[PDB]
Write a protein that binds this DNA or RNA. Structure first.
Lengths: 563, 553
RNA sequence: GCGCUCGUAGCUCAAUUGGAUAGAGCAUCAGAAGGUUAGGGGUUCGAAUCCUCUCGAGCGCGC
RNA sequence: GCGCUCGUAGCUCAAUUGGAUAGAGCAUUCAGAAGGUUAGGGGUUCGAAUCCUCUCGAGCGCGC
């Protein structure tokens, strides 16, 4: 149920009937304060200028043809001409009911698109670092959200499985095999190819045979790759990320394309051998002219083939990119090249969602106390430990068999539900005291809140198959608030899918919880004057439980049934 | 079924028919080779010397009266005079059959008693170092084994909750300026005078509030230790904590009544008892400084006196063997704890890495037990997600937990100084927890695919006609003997070796002696029944060790 | 030197993309307090949001 | 200086506590083979890795 889009039309299909142009835009948002009802129409003022009249007069000129009967119970004008809509109880207590009768809670299925999500993107022959945790989590949240809506999501893991370093890598592997897993690999082999070593010409030659390709050096490649991706699939499985091995499309598939991509870029008149390198000129920035590359004898030419392959072979209607902030240039530049070359059209967006670096409670890069890179596994280990200590001092002397299970949900959930709360792209603070707490917008609070709600719909007799025969009658203004927000689940979902931002979902869920936690300490679902309301508020509570569950599911957050 | 004890009496009260005296020992053990039958009787020789005559005449001089028909089917003599008993393929089948009918697999419940087990024993204000892992695992294994036998086991966690160290401790907890009152994050000891010091003169007496501030950082330590126990799957609780604090107000009268018996004498400046093994035994320094021995002695008394002990097992370090037998000689030459209640001391050395170097980190620090369990879990994850990758996530933490921590336990449970090596423990080859865990898996498989319902499988014969069947069936029944040795000697390593031997016997019995659809129904169910007992035996056996058992791998 | 992303309560984060009196959670003396949205100027009915400067933080291409 | 625990196949560990030809697992995918003066001498007895004694070497406890 997308009430916004509903009122969006009935106001648009109005307005016109009060003198308005075709390209018309009502601005139907959710009211800030509760003074302004459940929804606002802001589109007046802006329109009330292109015709040069008066906003507070164009206002009720629309209400004359605006018939929100059976929908709203109170429509009034306020301020410089806002149209405030106070939803009618009987309208809410009809879609609150419709959501219950559906396994998708009334959420409608959009036009079945085909989207490609680019997330995680770890490196080869290196233990996965914590600087990739953000990309992996948010990307998976996007995928889950899109998948629930019904689209066809192609998970894309752009693994750095190619580069110069493989000469330094494979040679070490070839040598490290003469003694007998990856922990001091990339680190030790680096100590050779600089100071000090003699047969690095062995390594610098070992790479030039990989581009040519013969199974021997091809095995030493895949062998080195498959081990890294096996270590990482473990990390994913621990992290509850939906990624898989057959979701890997790294810097290998987008490599034999490099010739006939700049050649075709030259065979279309767009490249000049400036400075000594193939370059392609664009025009939308500074006081002279900037310039990307392609060759010289790069991290911009690969993405072009990438963004092309998504469209031409994978039939991507849309393609999301969850990548570090320090890559916005290299993408936008290399994407503007695809916009003025016609590889991928216009109906196919190339979205880029960004984020900064991991920092601690001190503005410095997130590192260990030794002063170095933090392994993601080592982070998850402490997450589970700190969670155990958390659950212990509140629920001690309890079956260990169901503590690790609960500590898993709390700890691993907190690690995820911490990027799913921030939307910035200018670095971020990692603080255990913020994420692992029963207070605030934290996963444990949501997880506890969900158990709380669920308990109410448990201690009562009223079985499952006759409860939904007694209807919902909303008579009080806290039930109306709750029921409204409950129905705004589709809106939030559509915003997440559109903007690629899961923080909205979490903000909603946090906001959704607070309503219940206020609807509870005032409106006794427990026991009231009659059965008519007892069952009604149960269903009203029953919905949020299903809603909180489904919401947390789209984020990839475990939900324990009991705390 | 303790077949050993059976033949041990069926021979002693049969060696009597040879003039052999009362104080007699038939000394019958399990055979060394399969060609020496299932059991040997060794007690001939020494008795033949005792009464002058020749052994291999005294040998069959006994067989004349030895009536073992039914119980045996082939008693013969070899060597200098060994009586070699070969069990009868009907005596075994009868007991293999009845072992199934019990939930204890026939293991008789012995003379019910009250045993106290002293294990683990960590310190407060300190994250549990790895040096206490050995004591914890083995001790718990003993507790589980004894408890299965029906005894009343008292878990005793001798926590170092007392000492001079609480000076720098409490006078640093009062330095709680992070936030308000409360503590969760440890690492206090490595963190940090006359500003303190006098704090301990307040507490050591009968303090009012410093003891209230003492009964909390002990609580905060033993709270995280319970987490580690929970992770390790150890039956220890907080209720089982009986630290040095208990054995401290007892120290006056103990050193006092040790004077009102004429055993201790003031020497050098101290208070010293003399023993027969000489330097004296200091039980109070010149400064009134009590020792470990002074706490070790009050401890042994409290066990018998208030706890009604019949036996007290001490699973602690080997570095304290001197400081323990001495105090245990003082309890026995002063009439505190009697003679019928043993004070056993099971021991183990320091913990080393695969190079004889004391078990340190990669930087040379003392490994924290929590960090060890984390690595065990991780290396288990890699181990499992390789045999069968692309497999879920739940059945990957469920396994890696069992495989990981089980390997950690089933590695101290097979030794008695030692070397920790991930290569030796986390492998499906050899006497390791994974192999045992996978061995249990494969056994249950042959019991799974079958069509015969368990409830009707009961009323079915167990005919035994082949030597491999007899080999297995005999070994199965020897479950009680193994338990009896573990409970007695306090060594869980025997239970492992048996379990490892048993698992290997089934494997040989498997790909050799068909169960999966054979010549006739009379055989199929019989071997399925043989396969059912070993499954239960391996399960029940691994349970006494404290080893998790998954159902599929 | 050019160029990217930014600057919001003491801290960690919001603000439905230009809407009404900038909101939550810790912290500080259930409600309370906490703000010239780094700062000036400008664009219009209306700005934390957009345009131009200054200062400042983080990171990419530069001789 | 006295005293404690020990020394087994190239590594990690067994040997029913005084019993028969000292046994497995790694190492040199399943089968097989090979691997030893039980640190070493002496002694106790029908019989010793086990017990007694000295020597050598490892670890750790109170010395002085």
């Amino acid at each position: 149920m997308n009430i916004q889009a509903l009122l969006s039309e009935k106001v648009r299909q109005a307005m016109i009937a009060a003198g308005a142009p075709a390209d018309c835009e009502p601005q139907v948002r959710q009211s800030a304060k509760v003074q302004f009802g459940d929804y606002q129409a802001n589109g007046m003022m802006a329109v009330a200028k292109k015709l040069g009249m008066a906003p507070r007069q164009l206002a009720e000129q629309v209400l004359t043809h605006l018939d929100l009967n059976g929908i709203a119970s109170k429509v009034e004008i306020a301020g410089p001409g806002f149209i405030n809509i106070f939803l009618d109880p009987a309208f809410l207590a009809e879609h609150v009911q419709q959501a219950l009768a559906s396994d998708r809670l009334g959420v409608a299925t959009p036009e079945k698109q085909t989207i490609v999500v680019d997330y995680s993107a770890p490196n080869v022959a290196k233990e996965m670092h914590v600087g990739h945790l953000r990309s992996t989590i948010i990307g998976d949240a996007a995928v889950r959200t899109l998948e629930f809506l019904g689209h066809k999501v192609i998970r894309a893991n752009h693994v750095g499985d190619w580069g110069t370093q493989f000469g330094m890598l494979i040679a070490w592997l070839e040598k490290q095999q003469q003694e007998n897993d990856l922990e001091g690999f990339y680190r030790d082999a680096k100590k050779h190819y600089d100071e000090d070593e003699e047969f690095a010409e062995r390594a610098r030659n070992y790479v030039v045979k990989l581009q040519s390709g013969d199974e021997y050096f091809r095995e030493m490649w895949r062998k080195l790759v498959d081990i890294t991706m096996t270590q990482n699939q473990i990390t994913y499985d621990r992290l509850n990320v939906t990624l898989t091995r057959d979701d890997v499309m790294g810097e290998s598939l987008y490599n034999p394309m490099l010739p006939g991509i700049v050649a075709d870029l030259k065979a279309k008149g767009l490249a000049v051998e400036s400075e000594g390198a193939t370059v392609v000129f664009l025009d939308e920035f500074k006081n002279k002219e900037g310039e990307p590359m392609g060759v010289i004898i790069l991290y911009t030419t690969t993405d072009i083939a990438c963004a092309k392959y998504r469209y031409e072979t994978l039939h991507a209607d849309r393609v999301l990119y969850y990548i570090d902030s320090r890559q916005h240039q290299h993408l936008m530049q290399a994407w503007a090249i695809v916009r003025k070359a016609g590889y991928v059209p216009e109906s196919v967006p190339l979205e880029h969602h960004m984020f900064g670096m991991m920092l601690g409670k001190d503005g410095k890069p997130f590192k260990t106390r030794a002063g170095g890179t933090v392994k993601l596994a080592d982070l998850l280990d402490e997450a589970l430990e700190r969670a155990r200590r958390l659950v212990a001092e509140k629920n001690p002397d309890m079956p260990a068999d169901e503590l690790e299970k609960l500590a898993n949900a709390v700890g691993i959930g907190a690690v995820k539900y911490a990027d799913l709360s921030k939307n910035r792209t200018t670095d971020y603070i990692f603080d255990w005291d913020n994420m692992l707490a029963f207070e605030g917008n934290t996963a444990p609070y949501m997880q506890y809140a969900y158990t709380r709600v669920l308990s109410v719909f448990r201690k009562a007799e009223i079985d499952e198959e006759q409860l939904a025969a007694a209807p919902v009658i909303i008579r009080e203004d806290r039930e109306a608030q709750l029921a409204a927000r409950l129905l705004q689940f589709e809106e939030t979902l559509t915003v997440v899918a559109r903007e690629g931002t899961p923080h909205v979902m979490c903000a909603y869920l946090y906001d959704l919880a607070g309503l219940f936690s206020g609807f509870y300490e005032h409106c006794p679902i427990l026991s009231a004057e009659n059965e008519e309301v007892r069952n009604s508020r149960l269903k009203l509570a029953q919905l949020t439980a299903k809603t909180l569950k489904l919401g947390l599911d789209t984020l990839g957050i475990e939900t324990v049934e009991r705390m």
